[PDB]
Structures are given as C-alpha cells and as structure tokens.
Amino acid sequence: MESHKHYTQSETEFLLSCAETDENETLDYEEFVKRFHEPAKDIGFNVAVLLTNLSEHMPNDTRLQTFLELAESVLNYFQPFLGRIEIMGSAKRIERVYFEISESSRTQWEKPQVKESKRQFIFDVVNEGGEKEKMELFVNFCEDTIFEMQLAAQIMTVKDMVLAFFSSYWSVFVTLLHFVASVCRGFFRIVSSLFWKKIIAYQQKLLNYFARNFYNMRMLALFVAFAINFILLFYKVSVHYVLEESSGYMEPTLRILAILHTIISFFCIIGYYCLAVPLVIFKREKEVARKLEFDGLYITEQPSEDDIKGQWDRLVINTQSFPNNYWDKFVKRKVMDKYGEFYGRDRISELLGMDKAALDFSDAREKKKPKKDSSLSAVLNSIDVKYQMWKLGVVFTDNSFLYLAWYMTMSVLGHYNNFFFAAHLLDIAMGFKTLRTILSSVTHNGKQLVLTVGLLAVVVYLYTVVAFNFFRKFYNKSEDGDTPDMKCDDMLTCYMFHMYVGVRAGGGIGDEIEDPAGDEYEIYRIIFDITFFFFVIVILLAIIQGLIIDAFGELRDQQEQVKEDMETKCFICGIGNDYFDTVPHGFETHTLQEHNLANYLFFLMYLINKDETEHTGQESYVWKMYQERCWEFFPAGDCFRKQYE
Amino acid sequence: TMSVLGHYNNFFFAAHLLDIAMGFKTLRTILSSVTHNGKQLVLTVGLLAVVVYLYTVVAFNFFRKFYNKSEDGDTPDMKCDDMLTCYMFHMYVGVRAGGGIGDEIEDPAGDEYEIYRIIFDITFFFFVIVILLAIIQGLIIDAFG
Amino acid sequence: GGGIGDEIEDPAGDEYEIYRIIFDITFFFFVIVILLAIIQGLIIDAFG
Amino acid sequence: ELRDQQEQVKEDMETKCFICGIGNDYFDTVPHGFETHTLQEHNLANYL
Ligand SMILES: [Zn+2]
Ligand SMILES: [Zn+2]
Numbered sequence: 040m041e042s043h044k045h046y047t048q049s050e051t052e053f054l055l056s057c058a059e060t061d062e063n064e065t066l067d068y069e070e071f072v073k074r075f076h077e078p079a080k081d082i083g084f085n086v087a088v089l090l091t092n093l094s095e096h097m098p099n100d101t102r103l104q105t106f107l108e109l110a111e112s113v114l115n116y117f118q119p120f121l122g123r124i125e126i127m128g129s130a131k132r133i134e135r136v137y138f139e140i141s142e143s144s145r146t147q148w149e150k151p152q153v154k155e156s157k158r159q160f161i162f163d164v165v166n167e168g169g170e171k172e173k174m175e176l177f178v179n180f181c182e183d184t185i186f187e188m189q190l191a192a193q194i195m196t197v198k199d200m201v202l203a204f205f206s207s208y209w210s211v212f213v214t215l216l217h218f219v220a221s222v223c224r225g226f227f228r229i230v231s232s233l234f235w236k237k238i239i240a241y242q243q244k245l246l247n248y249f250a251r252n253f254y255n256m257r258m259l260a261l262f263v264a265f266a267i268n269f270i271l272l273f274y275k276v277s278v279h280y281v282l283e284e285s286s287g288y289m290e291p292t293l294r295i296l297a298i299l300h301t302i303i304s305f306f307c308i309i310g311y312y313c314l315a316v317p318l319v320i321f322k323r324e325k326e327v328a329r330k331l332e333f334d335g336l337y338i339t340e341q342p343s344e345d346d347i348k349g350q351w352d353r354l355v356i357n358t359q360s361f362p363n364n365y366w367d368k369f370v371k372r373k374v375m376d377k378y379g380e381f382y383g384r385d386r387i388s389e390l391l392g393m394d395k396a397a398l399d400f401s402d403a404r405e406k407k408k409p410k411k412d413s414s415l416s417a418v419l420n421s422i423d424v425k426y427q428m429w430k431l432g433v434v435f436t437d438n439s440f441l442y443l444a445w446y447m448t449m450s451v452l453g454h455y456n457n458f459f460f461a462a463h464l465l466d467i468a469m470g471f472k473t474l475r476t477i478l479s480s481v482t483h484n485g486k487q488l489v490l491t492v493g494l495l496a497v498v499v500y501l502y503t504v505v506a507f508n509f510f511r512k513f514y515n516k517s518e519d520g521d522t523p524d525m526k527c528d529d530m531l532t533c534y535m536f537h538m539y540v541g542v543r544a545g546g547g548i549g550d551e552i553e554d555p556a557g558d559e560y561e562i563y564r565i566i567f568d569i570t571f572f573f574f575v576i577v578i579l580l581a582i583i584q585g586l587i588i589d590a591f592g593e594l595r596d597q598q599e600q601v602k603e604d605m606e607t608k609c610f611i612c613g614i615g616n617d618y619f620d621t622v623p624h625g626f627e628t629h630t631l632q633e634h635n636l637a638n639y640l641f642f643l644m645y646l647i648n649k650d651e652t653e654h655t656g657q658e659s660y661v662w663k664m665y666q667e668r669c670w671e672f673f674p675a676g677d678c679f680r681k682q683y684e
Numbered sequence: 685t686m687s688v689l690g691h692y693n694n695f696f697f698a699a700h701l702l703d704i705a706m707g708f709k710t711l712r713t714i715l716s717s718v719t720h721n722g723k724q725l726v727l728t729v730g731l732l733a734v735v736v737y738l739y740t741v742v743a744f745n746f747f748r749k750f751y752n753k754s755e756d757g758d759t760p761d762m763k764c765d766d767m768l769t770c771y772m773f774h775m776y777v778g779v780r781a782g783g784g785i786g787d788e789i790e791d792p793a794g795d796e797y798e799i800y801r802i803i804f805d806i807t808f809f810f811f812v813i814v815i816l817l818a819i820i821q822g823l824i825i826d827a828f829g
Numbered sequence: 830g831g832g833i834g835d836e837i838e839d840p841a842g843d844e845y846e847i848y849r850i851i852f853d854i855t856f857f858f859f860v861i862v863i864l865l866a867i868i869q870g871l872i873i874d875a876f877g
Numbered sequence: 878e879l880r881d882q883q884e885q886v887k888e889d890m891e892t893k894c895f896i897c898g899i900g901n902d903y904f905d906t907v908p909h910g911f912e913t914h915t916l917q918e919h920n921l922a923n924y925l
Contacts, residue, residue: 170912197846201768268737274744274767461741464734477727480822481815492810525793539802543783543809545830580814587815588822588873589880592829613905675908717870718863729858762841776850780831780857817862824863825870829877 087117088137095123095135119145122638122645125679126672128657133674133682136657140641147188148637156184157636161610165601174670177610181640185647186321186364194247201272202285208266212292219299235415249310256303256310257470263300264463267293271458297453297460304450308443312434319437320430321364327352328362328370333668337390338378351436355429357392363426366647442469476594483590488583495579499542502571503534510564513553547572609634612674614681633679720827725820732816736779739808740771747801750790784809832857894919 040046040054057075059066090110097103107114121137128134147153160180168176230241270293273284282290330336337356342349355361362370371391379387388394434440446463453459468474481488506514507530514527514536527533541548549568555561607616609626611634619626646654646662654662661672690696705711718725743751744767751764751773764770778785786805792798834853840846892901894911896919904911 171909195843197772198768200847271741272768272771276748276765458741458745461738464738467734468731474727474731477724477731477819480819488815525791535802539786539806543787543806545782583814584818584821587818588825591822591826593880595826595829671908676906676910714867717867725863762839772850776834776854780835780854782830820862821866821869824866825873828870828874 083113084117084120084139087114088121090114091121092135092137122641123632124638124642125633125674126657126661127674127677128660128672133677133679134657135679136642138642138645140645143192144188144641144644147192148640150191153184153188161605162601165604166597174673177636178643178670181643182325183318183322184640185644186366187318190317194250198284201269205269246313249306250313253307253310253314256307260300260303260307261466261471263296263303264460264466267296267300267460268464270296271460293457297457300460301450301454304447308447311440311443315439316434317364320433323352323433324362324365327356328365331356332370332374332377335378338374338382338387347436351429351432354425357390358423358426358429359392359396360423360426361392479594480587480590483593484586487586491579491582491586495542495575496538498575498579499537500534502567502575503530503537505567506537507533510560510567512557513555513564515553541571542575545576547576610636611639612676612678614676614678619680629678629680634674717824717827721823724823728816728819728823732779732812733775735812735816736774737771739804739812740767740774742804743774744770747797747804749794750792750801752790778808779812782813784813830861832861895921896924
C-alpha cells in the first residue's frame, strides 16, 4: 500500500489501525473489502449525484466551486457511473434527472454488434423513418437493445500450383485437428462422467458456449466450405468420378472435412436457437401484447386472413406463460381492466386463459393454501406445451432459421454427392455482410432490372414476328451446304434464336445471318439490323448499366444524408447545430452529455430493472408515461440551455 | 536497383515508366478513379470467380458432350473432363468471349438439354458479363463523382 | 474486344500455360476493362 | 436527372409550405408544428 504512494502516512496508519489484527497478523482482504467498500460505494455515489446536481443547477458560485475542487477526487470515480437525462416533467420545465449506469450495462453497450445495430437503426430511421413515430422507433430499438444486452450479459505447373498452394494449409489443418481432438478426446473424460443438478448445470454451460461462439463457427464453416471446394478442383472423369491428382492424403481428408462441416453446421443451427431465437420471440411477444393492450386485436379488431402472423398469434394469448420474454407480466391484468366492463367479465378471461386459475386464486386467498411439491424426472407435465408449440411455429416461420436449415440440408446432401458443398459458397452473399456494398448496387433497383429484361423480351419478340413475316431466305444457318436447318420456319424457334444469339452477338443480329444483298430487301433489312443493334444492345444494356451505376450513387447519397443529419441536428430535440455552436464545442458537448442516446437507453434500463415501489418522483412520472406510451417527456424542441441562461 | 539491373539486361528500364504513376501527380485525377474503391474491385473479381466456379461445377456435372474443342475432327481435347481444366477454360474464355460462353461451345441441339443449356448460356451472359462488368464500370464511374 | 489472347495461338505449351493465361487475363482486365471504363466514366462525369 | 427532380420535389414539400411558403424552421418551434400547419391550417385538400 505504500509502494503505490496513493495513500499518505496518515492514511496508511489509519488503515493499519482499521485492520483486523486478530492475534495472528493476518487479515482476510475479501471480507475487508466486503465490509468497507460497498456501503462506501453507495453513499459516495449518492453524494456524487447530489454534488453534480448542485454544480449543474448552481453555476457561477465560487463558494460551491471551492468545495467541488477538493471534492473532485471522489467525484471522478463515479464519472463513468452516473447518467443525466433532460426530460419534460412539470408543465414547461426541462428537468435534469440523474441515475446510475451499471458497469455491466456500459460493457455490453460497447460490443461491436450493439454498435453496428445502433448505426443501422440511425441510418434507417434517418432515411425512411418518419417524424410522428421517431420516438416510437427509438423506444422500440432501446427495448430490443436492452433485451439483447441482458441476454449477452447473462451468458509442369498447370496442375501442381494449386497443390502447392494447398500444401501450405496443412499447418492450419493440423491445428484444427488438435482443436477438435481436445474436444473429442480431451473433454470426453468430463462429458461422459459416470445427478440432475450436475447434468443441467453442464447442458446450460454448453448451450451458453454455443450461443457465445455462434458467429466464430459461422466463419469456421465458411472456411471449411472453401477448403472443400478448393480440394474439389481435383476431379477427373473415367461415368466414374475419381480424385487421383496427388501423392495421397487427400481422399480421406475430403471425407473427414465433409463430416466436420456437417457437424459444424448442426452446431450452428443449434446455437442460433440459443442466441437469436430469444430476441425474435421477445419482439413477437412485445408486438402481440401491445396490440392486445392498445388495439384490442383479439377482442374488438379480429385479424383478417391476409396475415398469418395475426392468426398464429391467437393460440399464444391464452397460455399461462404468455409474456415469457417481455420483462413484465401485468399485461393480461392490464387488458382485463381495460376491457372487463366494456366487454364480458368472464368472456375476456376465457379467451385470455387463467379463468379457472383466477377463480382458484380468489378462492385460495382465504384460509386454503397447500404446499406444492417438486418431483425429479416429472417436469414434462409442468412445462407448457401450447406455448412451446407456438414458439416452434414462430421459429420455423423465421427466415434466418430457414436459411440455416437449408444450409444443413445441403451439407447433408453433400455426403450423398460430394458437389452440393458448392452451394455453400452462396453463404458469402446470403450470409456475411462483407459483400453488401457490391450486392446492394444490384439489389437496390431489382424490380427495374426484371422490368428491363421483360421489355427486352417484348422488343425481341416484336422483331421476331417482323423477321418471321418478312425475312424467309436469311435464317439459313446451314453447315457444309445443302443442309438447311435452325431456320425461321418456326415462330418459337425464331424467337429462341433471336433471344439466344442476337442479344449476345455484340453486333446486333446482322453479323450471324446472310448478307442482305437480295433485291427489294437490301435497305429494309439494313434498317432492321441497324435498329436491332441500336435498340437492343445499345440503349437496352445501357439501361441496365445505368441502373447499376445509379444504385451506387443513391446509396452514397443516403449515407451522406445520414452523416449530414447527424452532424447538423440533434437526434432527440432537433434544435440545430448553429444554436449550440455559440459556446466553444457546444453541439458536441450537447450531443455527448445532455442528450445522449446511450444515456436515454441506460435510463430506460434503470427504470425497467430497478423496481416498481421505490421510484422517485421523476422516475415514477416517466415510468407511468412510458407504461401508457405517450412520450412528451422526450424534449421535443427545447433543452436546458434554451430553458435557462 | 532497377536502373542497376538495366545495365545487365537492357530492358528493366521499362520498369521506370511506372514512375509516371507511382511518382508525379499529373495522373492522380485518373488513377484515383481506380484506387478510390480498390477493395470493391477485388471483391467484385472474387465474386466473379465464385460465380464462374458455380457455373463450372454445373457444367461439369450436366454438360459432357459440349466442351469438345477439337481441331480437324476426331482429336478431342481441352474438354470438361477435368474440373480444374473446366474452371480454367471458363475463367479464360467465357469471361472474355463477349457473348457469354455459348459462342465458344457446340450448338445446343441435343435432345433433353436444349432449353436447359439455353438457360445456362443466357444466364451466364446476363450475370457474368452484363451485371458483373457493369458493377466494375459503375465503381469506376462513381469514384469520379 | 477479348484482350490479346483471342488473336494468338492457344497457350498449351509447357512451362508457359499459367504464365500466359495470367498475361492474357491481366491484359483483358487492365486494358479493355478498367481503361475504357475510365474513358466512359470521364464522358459520363462531364454530363453530370 | 429524374432522381434529382424527385428529390427536389420531396425537399421542397418537406421544408416549405405550398401556400404561404414560410419555412420549416419557423413552424418547428411548437412540438410537431410544421406537420400540424400543413395538415390543419393550410391543407390543399381543405382549400379544394
Ligand atoms: Zn438535443
Ligand atoms: Zn402555410
């Protein structure tokens, strides 16, 4: 403690006197910290919040500043611990509320996935987001981010050149084999031990490991697919396909690599169920619960047959574990209170479930209460079946799970035929986002491209009928002479010939057909050919190239618009850069300290996870207003600096 | 070093013409249109390689009697019988052919494969040298803007 | 239109197959792919 | 050019009023001011 030289002589002697020194000159630093740090942390945080409030609300006070200067030593400890939100409390009053931000929350906020999600949310709310629902979208994004952060926290050289290129990857193959051996043999003595406690605590750990490493094994599967497809470049025909292109050591490694790829694909499809299924289930439950509470979907506004989501979300509202992932349970009671007198007192509860359960609870509120017993190997009756089946239906409807199912199916078929592994190269497009900047230039228009090819087909069809009617003696692609075939004698044959030859010929259709020297048709067929060239492969491929090029510019313009809006406006109050740019570095300080989106998200987390009973006045106000989902507590066009001097 | 080697072989002085690019800034306005994206261009060529590889395996599995570039007749060679040979043939001929890959291979008149190989060829043309060179040209053009 | 390999003998001679393939494909990709695209891009950018 | 025309139309209709042409900034002092002005006070449908 004296080598650090943070503590002076007085402090060191004080702590040495405060030591236990219980007749052994030995102290338990664990219990010492446990008794002398946590209450100190709590009271110090409260004092820091009080001093920060006094400083921010009592400016230009030298008497307060002199105290703050000596108080700075402890005030800096809680600097990355206290948030600050500017809300609208009393009528026309921008109140600055303070709260605590947990280290776990701040750690999970800086994860790259969360940052990318926030960037995408900002992008697609600036571009196509509205104004009446900006705070709606922001609160939805905040709720999803809080749920996912909690989930994450709770967890001869033409042939030999390629041979030489792959021979350098044995150094990676051997370490992959060592990694899989440390699991199949080094972990076997633990995974095959010899009860329920020690098996559940292990299966939960394994599921958490898969959820943690879901993406890393996606990369691993991609690399294994590349290796398989590279070693597939050594095949020869003899009706029989043979891999005889090296000095052995490839025929068995291909099979073991295919087996490894299938195993990794299965582990990916089971890790997705642990990582991303809870998030989509949370979103679905939140959506259906809010529809029930604020719209009376299955009460007054029965969903139509157009949407399957509404129909499939009908057999979930009547189960007991309905809000399994919504961090609240007072939704059935809320809707019962809202529609219990306007509609059937029992007719609401019969289709919301727990009707007999409500009657039993009312009866048991009297002097009638037994003790429930728990029996091992007898939880199949305890677990819900209807809710699980609804969840399975939602999962199998989910698109991202279907992609992994198709991936697994192709991997399985790769064993039957050792070429379906080529279909796994499509994961670089349908999967990772490293090629999105290029594939977006094609998929941005999309409909325009297919409309262009349809127009091309129609124009070629018109030219085809014109050729069929007026040009007989020209479509005479005969080989060696006196063997006329592949002619214009059939209408569909001519259409196929046009679409397949004239479009790709590069020089129209006149470069693949006889010389137009026959009388009375020279100029007519010259016009025909030159117009084909100028209309089909001059201003119809130029249209496709123009669509592709314009997609790049449109995406760049969208990105520039997002950057412009986020640099010259505030996301929450939307006042403007110029007003805040009067104090040196004003706008950046306003967007980093006063109106921080991360701070607002942390405040929402604090309200949700703190409690219901000991909210302060501002916390209770904001909580009630968030529960009723109206949101004028978000500063609309005002801030603290506009409110005061 | 190149100047010194030019004395040993009087042709390494051709490597000094690269100083107009790596040196003086008179050509920066033009070379920036290529080097501004850069990573996008190599990603595009990688995607082109992957698409041509997929088409190569499809051709290897389903089109045997077509890759028959025999000269003077009865001398079959340069075929699709080898997977890497077919991939090399595709990358080296179909990409640069200007008319897809159907303009360098036999006429698809064989029964039960006419429409299938027509679809194969037209899709090669429309995906590889229509909207994949257009992507490269669009990157080059967008760099200017 | 197809580089320089479409006007010259087939690169089947030993010890030069891959080298001349690289030569031809690089000619195609550098001279008539991103060097005529530069001219077309200049023409198009002038309009804008 | 067509994309620029569409963007210009959207820009004008989002930062100006069709009738009085005052501007977005003046009305954006009351919460949701410009939208209320363009939906209730100076509605083209209302004038028709
Ligand atoms: Zn603000
Ligand atoms: Zn107006």
